[PDB]
């Protein structure tokens, strides 16, 4: 089975071509922490710790072109599928993990064995290592699940509230001309307030979820970075 | 001065980007693509009827049946298949003629 | 239900179907055509890359002796749990 | 005798149970901000930094509530 379809970004692609045929400075980035990993001077890393910047920026652009514009009615999030997000996060996370593993430095994993020599090795430390190794994959899964669920829930709620607002506005506006106009006015004002609140909340939540999505990957990378001191 | 992004053409820069900048990511993506097309590229007729149509399956015309009919007609005509062969029917040609005369 | 139906791609244009057997056979024909010429010796890494993994997977499939039944991958109906056929 | 029964209305019950998970999430979020206020009054110079950490905690806590809310939609729409 081969389905031929298209993304919902063609107009946005046209706008990108129109408005970016000439250069422009960028000074505001959703996830700025990918550019500043080291905060104490004289510390440097031999690993390619700045390799994630390009992917981070592209992912932010793509997910912002989809999610932020999805607040416009009838705009489609073409990628909104659980397993597709799983594939994306699998790609990024496993690629970085295999980059660390191909280094063939086993000492890098010494920190997995949690605790000190005082703790019993078999009954405490080994179990903790098992849990942490499980927790890496669980972090991947939680990242993709969170990204999926936030969008799904937000858009379900928006659709339901908009349906209710349409119903009351269309089939009960005549109450403005009736003696119970005050009740309708109160309800309409409440609905407007709810509309504004929901839109603001969704706008903020989209950006914050993208921030967290990139921060999980950067945390994976940082957990295995080692910094040398200049002398 | 020479820079990959400014001096090289798009296909060359693409190859360089995914071979000397993000090769592991490309490898993982290809692996995942192969997995998807190996295990997630099939849809049964019942699944299509349940979920494969925007408004629901139009049983009043059964387009799946027409599609399969066209498929099988094309295969038979092009491959010169004798559908009256005993293996397809489970009985000899003479028995088939007897049945036709009976019914 | 109806709200759930809003989360679908909105620009579906065409759907094509093809049997696994048919396109696998076509791919095998292409691979044989490109790996047949004499100027590609059987001991070359390219030829082995092309053939060895496929041979290994097919051998593993043939050697399989499972006590359970695996329903046909391409049945007409795979949605009924109580009918593997 | 073998009798198979399929009750349709049960999906409402399971949906309502998942919503209870939001009680912990909603409470958990309020706990974060309560500490934020009690912390900004102890060291106002870091109010901007603390506000940033509070928001991060809100999303992580909020994320869990969505998991439950997804299950509610799944059963409510099936």
């Amino acid at each position: 089975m081969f389905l031929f379809f298209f993304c919902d970004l063609f107009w946005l692609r046209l706008l990108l071509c129109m408005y970016y045929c000439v250069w422009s400075r960028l000074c505001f980035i959703v996830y700025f922490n990918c550019l500043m990993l080291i905060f104490d001077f004289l510390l440097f890393c031999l690993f390619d710790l700045y390799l994630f910047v390009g992917l981070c920026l592209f992912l932010l652009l793509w997910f912002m072109l989809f999610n932020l514009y999805s607040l416009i009615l009838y705009y489609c999030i073409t990628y909104l599928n659980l397993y597709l997000l799983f594939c994306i996060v699998f790609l990024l996370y496993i690629a970085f993990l295999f980059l660390f593993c191909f280094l063939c430095d086993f000492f890098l994993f010494n920190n997995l064995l949690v605790g000190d020599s005082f703790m019993d090795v078999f009954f405490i430390r080994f179990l903790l290592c098992f849990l942490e190794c499980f927790s890496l994959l669980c972090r991947c899964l939680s990242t993709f699940l969170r990204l999926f669920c936030n969008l799904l829930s937000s858009h379900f709620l928006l659709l339901m509230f908009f349906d209710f607002f349409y119903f009351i506005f269309v089939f009960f506006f005549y109450g403005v001309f009736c003696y119970w106009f005050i009740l309708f006015i109160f309800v309409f004002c409440f609905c407007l307030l709810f509309y504004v609140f929901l839109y603001l909340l969704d706008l903020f939540a989209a950006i914050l979820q993208l921030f967290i999505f990139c921060n999980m990957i950067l945390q994976l990378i940082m957990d295995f970075l080692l910094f040398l001191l200049f002398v | 001065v020479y820079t990959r992004w400014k001096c090289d053409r798009l296909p060359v820069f693409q190859l360089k980007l995914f071979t000397q900048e993000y090769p592991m990511h490309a490898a993982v993506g290809i692996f995942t693509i192969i997995f998807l097309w190996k295990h997630m590229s099939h849809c049964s007729e019942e699944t299509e009827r349940k979920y494969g149509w925007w408004a629901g399956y139009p049983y009043w015309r059964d387009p799946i049946a027409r599609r399969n009919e066209t498929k099988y007609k094309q295969m038979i005509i092009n491959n010169d298949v004798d559908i009256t062969h005993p293996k397809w029917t489970g009985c000899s040609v003479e028995q088939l003629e007897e049945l036709s005369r009976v019914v | 239900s109806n709200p759930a139906d809003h989360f679908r791609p909105n620009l579906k244009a065409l759907t094509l179907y093809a049997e696994r057997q048919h396109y696998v056979d076509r791919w095998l024909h292409v691979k044989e055509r490109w790996l047949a010429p004499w100027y590609l010796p059987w001991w070359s890494p390219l030829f082995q890359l092309g053939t060895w993994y496929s041979q290994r997977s097919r051998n593993l499939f043939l050697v399989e002796n499972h006590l359970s039944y695996r329903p046909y991958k391409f049945r007409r109906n795979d949605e009924d749990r109580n009918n593997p056929y | 005798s073998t009798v198979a029964i399929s009750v349709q209305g049960l999906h409402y019950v399971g949906t309502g149970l998942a919503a209870i998970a939001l009680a912990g999430v909603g409470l958990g979020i309020g706990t974060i901000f309560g500490n934020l206020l009690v912390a900004c009054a102890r060291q106002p110079n870091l109010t901007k930094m603390l506000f940033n950490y509070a928001i991060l905690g809100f999303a992580l806590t909020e994320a869990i509530g969505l998991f439950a809310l997804m299950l509610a939609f799944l059963m409510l729409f099936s």
């Binding site: 990628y79 | 998807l36 590229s41 | - | -």
Partner: peptide, 29 residues
């Protein structure tokens, strides 16, 4: 729900893979 579906997952993911392998270089340059 299609978001939880898999009957055309491969074709659906081709969009992301095209964006990653073909559109990202153009945006990069």
């Amino acid at each position: 729900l299609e978001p939880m579906s898999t009957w055309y997952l491969a074709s659906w993911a081709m969009v992301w893979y095209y964006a990653f392998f073909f559109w990202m270089p153009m945006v990069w340059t």
